[PDB]
Amino acid sequence: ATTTATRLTGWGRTAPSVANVLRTPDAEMIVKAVARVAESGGGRGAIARGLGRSYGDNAQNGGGLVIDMTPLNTIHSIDADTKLVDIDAGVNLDQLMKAALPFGLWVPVLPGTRQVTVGGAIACDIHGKNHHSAGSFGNHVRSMDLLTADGEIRHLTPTGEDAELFWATVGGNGLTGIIMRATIEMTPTSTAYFIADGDVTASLDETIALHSDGSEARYTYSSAWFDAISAPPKLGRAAVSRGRLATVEQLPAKLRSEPLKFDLTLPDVFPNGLANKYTFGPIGELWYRKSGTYRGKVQNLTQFCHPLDMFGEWNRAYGPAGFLQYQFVIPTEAVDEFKKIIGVIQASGHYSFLNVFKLFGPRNQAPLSFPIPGWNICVDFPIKDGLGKFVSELDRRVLEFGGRLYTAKDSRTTAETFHAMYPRVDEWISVRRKVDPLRVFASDMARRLELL
Ligand SMILES: Cc1cc2nc3c(=O)[nH]c(=O)nc-3n(C[C@H](O)[C@H](O)[C@H](O)COP(=O)(O)OP(=O)(O)OC[C@H]3O[C@@H](n4cnc5c(N)ncnc54)[C@H](O)[C@@H]3O)c2cc1C
Ligand SMILES: CCOC(=O)NC(=O)c1ccsc1NC(=O)c1nc2ccccc2s1
């Protein structure tokens, strides 16, 4: 065990605050610190911290305690018959994925990076490429052990007594207490590969049409890269990547002897950089269209889920240092309003190169869960004069159109905007006050967003 004064930021490397960081692989030492925060006064409290991949301020607590959960990383059991994994909250999804593949089990929700803790995944109720077919992370938790303000460990499940606290903890940003341990139901798989279809659209209207033609129901996974810089009609054109997990019959013979195995970058070889005389004219368009259009292509995890790994030190000049990540969802029916927000973005003078578009499916019952059925987009803006004031206008537009921002990608929204975006906030706050009357759990985010 060590306790250290530490300057913490989120992944965006902004809004720094100093906290006493506790780092111990001893679960009883964690209980004792919480018990101490609870007994001695009220104070500025405590917040859990995972791998620090949230862009915002939800895993810091200026002048209070931060409990680093990463050394609690025991996988206790995996069972192929029940499909259940029992894991400490500090286990990460990369570690879990590799540990579970030999059992023919797949992590049911994967984010854009595997460097996230199980606790972080639950507390942000993370989503991925299969949201429309599988929901978000919290949908797959069968039990969790929550260390609450009174220093007891409550065993929470999604149904029966304490369901309310379970669903307040899902997406609760650590503010109901410290998840120590959890059971996740995994997805059975016979391979570590995807079968994928690719389509490339010419415009925004084409991108939308493809996502509302009914074809989404044929694919368990689906996401798109999105042009946010070009003027219409090119604005909102997309490289759409859709697929499902392959079965072993669908693999080529060379891969069929290790169906479950998990298997030198572009800036090193074919760089610097990628452009030629063709790239920005009609041949480049044709090439782009033809290489992004395919059917029944076998891909590994890296190809299908982390296609940004191909580019190397190039993903350093697109974040995170002088960059502001911004993610929002607009309800399905507000299609015209979605197109309107995209127009506002391209004409703003703020140029976002990397844009992830996805159509979300049904929501779950967590009051603070980000995803709702509708048009989800993530953008990444260079930090520049006027950006802060422009994203405030974006906030207003998102709110007006019935949508919301993601707390994992936010450090600059107001309490007022957030509360209007999350109309079940009062219901959630009221659960939080029942389980933490003394405000033992607190973070910079809780104070900024008035969730304390
Ligand atoms: C490159 C990149 C790609 C990403 N892609 C996606 C994506 O596709 N989809 C998506 O949904 N998200 C995505 N994210 C966001 C990320 O998945 C979430 O922010 C996730 O919560 C971070 O997990 P973490 O362990 O780093 O948690 P941290 O960032 O350390 O903490 C996040 C929150 O979880 C809480 N928390 C952490 N551990 C515990 C615990 N043991 N008990 C209680 N509360 C806890 C913290 O208190 C904090 O409120 C991405 C982030 C990056 C940097
Ligand atoms: C679709 C896979 O995309 C990625 O490779 N992710 C990235 O590298 C990346 C880098 C910084 S932020 C980020 N990705 C994201 O924040 C993503 N959000 C969603 C939402 C739904 C479906 C897929 C994604 S990926």
DSSP of 226-286:
E--SSPTTTTT-EEEEEEEEPPGGGS-GGGTTSTT-----TTTSS-S----SSTTSHHHHH
**Do 321 and 94 touch, CB atoms closer than 8 A?**
no
Distances (CA, A) of 71 to 159, 176, 387: 30, 21, 38
**Do 326 and 274 touch, CB atoms closer than 8 A?**
no
> What was the resolution (in A) of this experimentally determined structure?
2.2
How far, in Å, CA of 229 to CA of 237, rounded? Answer: 10
- Residue of 206, 294, 288, 178 whose CA lies nearest to 243: 294
How far, in Å, CA of 439 to CA of 65, rounded? Answer: 13
How far, in Å, CA of 75 to CA of 107, rounded? Answer: 14
**Do 8 and 16 touch, CB atoms closer than 8 A?**
yes
Q: Where are the beta strands (DSSP E) in 53-168?
A: 65-68, 75-79, 84-88, 105-106, 141-147, 153-156
Q: Which residues are annotated as a binding site for FAD?
A: 48-58, 112, 117-120, 124-127, 179, 406
Identify the sign of the CA torsion 113, 116, 121, 124. negative
Which tokens belong to 97? 């994925």
Residues with CB under 6 A from ligand 2: 112, 127-129, 223, 305-308, 356, 358, 376, 378
Amino acid at 428: W
**Do 314 and 266 touch, CB atoms closer than 8 A?**
yes
**Do 157 and 106 touch, CB atoms closer than 8 A?**
no
Method: X-ray
DSSP of 273-342:
----SSTTSHHHHHHHHHHS-EEEEEE-HHHHH-GGGSS-GGGGTTSSTTEEEEEEEEETT-HHHHHHHH
Reduced DSSP (H G I as helix, E B as strand, rest coil) percent helix, strand, coil of the chain, to 5:
30, 25, 45
**Do 49 and 8 touch, CB atoms closer than 8 A?**
yes
How far, in Å, CA of 446 to CA of 440, rounded? Answer: 12
- Residue of 241, 259, 129 whose CA lies nearest to 193: 259
Which tokens belong to 128? 């991925």
120 lines ligand 1 (CB under 6 A): yes
Three-class HEC string of 379-400: EEEECCCCHHHHHHHHHHHHHH
How far, in Å, CA of 319 to CA of 288, rounded? Answer: 24
Element (H, E) at 23: strand 17-23
Residue nearest to atom 36 of ligand 1 (CA): 120
**Do 67 and 46 touch, CB atoms closer than 8 A?**
yes
Helix 335-346 / helix 387-400 crossing angle, nearest 10 deg: 170
CA of 426 to the centre of ligand 2 (A): 30
How far, in Å, CA of 243 to CA of 397, rounded? Answer: 32
